[PDB]
């Protein structure tokens, strides 16, 4: 029944995070115990034999096989190469029946997406980075999948919408800001969702005496903003265009593809996997010329 607290702002401002100590320990142990361990890695010479490899062109043959073992355990359970492949012919993108191996052609896109996350959105994911495990956590479906439902659904802030500001940056009313109180309710609903997605409260990113202030806010607010821009790219360019690839059992009632949100990576924790650093161990997924000064072992 003890409560852990973390101070995140100045003395006396009550910018604090509170956790039920028992509840947090069970959540944390529930991550530790399943956390999948990595293979060791090794450094051969020699030219690449692959017949139909289009993304992983740039890694050694040993690093490639090491990556496939990781992908199996992170998405399908360990050694489950049959989840993606016609195991008699790994280069195939179709079954013997000619029907396409939809998971393999999705997984090729998910590699490009992961490289794009780890490369272009380092202002968000920094040197923790993401792997397939971050979303999938050992299962084919991540958490927090969402579909079209209503026009005013706030999760469209992570796809095709842009503005969320409502506060005036001046004393007097002006034509610059004609925001409705209903729009402030909409931002408030959106912000509760982000708070729950991380398991934090509003004071993690704001001094609530002025929500619009960046100077009074913790630096996490700047990281959070880059998370919005990242999700828009992830949803608009990688997840949403996979609509013709999935079986109709995966699609939404509008026939749209499942889309991601903050909770998909974070799963109610302030960092994904409480900050477990795995991307550093898998250069196939860096999308980056060095990871924290460790250079990419390219061929």
């Amino acid at each position: 029944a003890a409560t852990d607290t973390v101070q995140v702002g100045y003395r006396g401002t009550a910018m604090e995070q509170n956790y039920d100590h028992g509840d947090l320990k069970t959540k944390f142990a529930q991550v530790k115990l399943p956390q999948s361990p990595p293979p060791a890695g090794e450094s051969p010479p020699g030219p690449l034999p692959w017949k139909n490899v289009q993304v992983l062109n740039d890694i050694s043959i040993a690093e490639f096989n090491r990556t496939m073992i990781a992908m199996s355990t992170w998405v399908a359970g360990t050694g489950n190469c049959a989840y993606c492949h016609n195991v008699a012919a790994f280069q195939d993108d179709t079954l013997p029946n000619g029907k396409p191996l939809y998971t393999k052609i999705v997984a090729r896109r998910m590699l490009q997406m992961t490289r794009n996350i780890n490369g272009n959105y380092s202002q968000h994911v920094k040197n923790t980075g993401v792997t397939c495990y971050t979303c999938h956590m050992g299962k084919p479906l991540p958490n927090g999948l969402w579909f079209y439902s209503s026009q005013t659904d706030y999760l469209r802030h992570y796809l095709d919408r842009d503005g969320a500001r409502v506060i005036t940056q001046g004393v007097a009313p002006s034509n610059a800001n004609r925001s409705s109180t209903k729009q402030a309710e909409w931002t408030y609903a959106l912000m509760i969702s982000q708070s729950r997605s991380l398991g934090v409260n509003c004071t993690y990113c704001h001094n609530t005496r002025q929500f619009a202030s960046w100077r009074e806010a913790p630096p996490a607010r700047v990281t959070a903003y880059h998370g919005i821009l990242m999700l828009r790219d992830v949803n608009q360019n990688y997840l949403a265009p996979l609509q013709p690839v999935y079986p109709a059992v995966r699609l939404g009632a509008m026939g749209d593809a499942p889309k991601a949100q903050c909770v998909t990576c974070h799963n109610g924790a302030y960092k994904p996997l409480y900050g477990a650093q795995m991307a550093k161990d898998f250069p196939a997924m860096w999308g980056r010329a060095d990871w924290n000064g460790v250079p990419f072992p390219g061929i």
């Binding site: 003890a2 409560t3 607290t5 003395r11 006396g12 509760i192 005496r209």
Partner: protein
């Protein structure tokens, strides 16, 4: 000076501690032993507040801010610049508010009155003691108290509220707010009724308890009576402070999620789960 009827009432007796030694008046004020301790804690606490202002960035009355320590100090006294001054002032404030209540008891005893006023004030002391002692102690750090500053404590209230995402959904807070609003309504009705029978239109006799009971009866559908409205006013005003203390002590020590998700129990009653 004295009210024209006062001198007759200024007897010795009714003290709790000091006996006759402090049993005297200073102008209008009764002193007593707890008068002495009051002025000690008031003066010390005030001058330390002025020292806090002096070593802070401004003398602007609204902006003065004496902040509690960082949470890392736990239940220890921090360095005085770092929040220890807030901790000393908090001890003075407790000493002053306690002394004030016990002085009121000496005054009530000397006048042969019931002890209602000291105890009604205990409801406010309870709420203060909850904010600066009980709730910080259950959270394990004095740094959870509110800062002493006319607007900086409103920044604390704001941030504590949003620590639970949507504090309006706190169920004890809804009760406390209902008491505060009902109290202000009842105060306006009681004030209006007494003034309306004692100040009727020119050329009208002074009214009576019967008229105010008749008016009150067709306002609420029942007549509360003279003792009843004072019992109700005391119940509502003190009950608001007690439910306020409950609403803040449950926030953090006993509940940590957002308040809107507390209402999940209501959605899951088995008649309609």
């Amino acid at each position: 000076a004295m009210l024209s009827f006062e001198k007759k009432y200024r007897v010795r007796g009714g003290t709790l501690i000091g006996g006759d030694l402090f049993d005297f008046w200073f102008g209008p004020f009764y002193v007593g032993f707890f008068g002495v301790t009051t002025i000690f804690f008031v003066t010390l606490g005030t001058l330390l507040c002025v020292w806090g202002a002096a070593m802070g960035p401004t003398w602007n009355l609204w902006q003065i801010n004496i902040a509690p320590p960082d949470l890392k100090y736990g239940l220890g006294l921090a360095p005085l610049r770092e929040g220890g001054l807030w901790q000393i002032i908090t001890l003075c404030a407790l000493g002053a508010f306690g002394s004030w209540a016990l002085r009121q008891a000496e005054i009530a005893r000397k006048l042969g009155m019931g002890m209602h006023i000291p105890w009604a004030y205990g409801g406010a002391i309870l709420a203060y003691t909850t904010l600066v002692v009980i709730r910080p102690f259950l959270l394990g750090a004095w740094g959870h108290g509110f800062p002493y500053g006319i607007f900086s404590h409103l920044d604390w209230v704001s941030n504590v509220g949003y620590q639970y995402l949507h504090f309006h959904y706190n169920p004890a807070h809804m009760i406390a707010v209902t008491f505060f609003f009902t109290n202000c309504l009842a105060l306006a009705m009681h004030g209006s009724l007494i003034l309306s029978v004692t100040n009727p239109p020119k050329g009208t006799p002074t009214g009576t308890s019967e008229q105010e009971n008749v008016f009150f009866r067709d306002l609420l559908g029942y007549s509360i009576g003279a003792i009843g409205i004072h019992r109700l006013g005391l119940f509502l005003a003190v009950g608001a402070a007690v439910w306020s203390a409950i609403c803040i002590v449950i926030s953090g020590p006993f509940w940590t999620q957002g308040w809107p998700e507390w209402w999940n129990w209501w959605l899951n009653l088995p008649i309609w789960k």
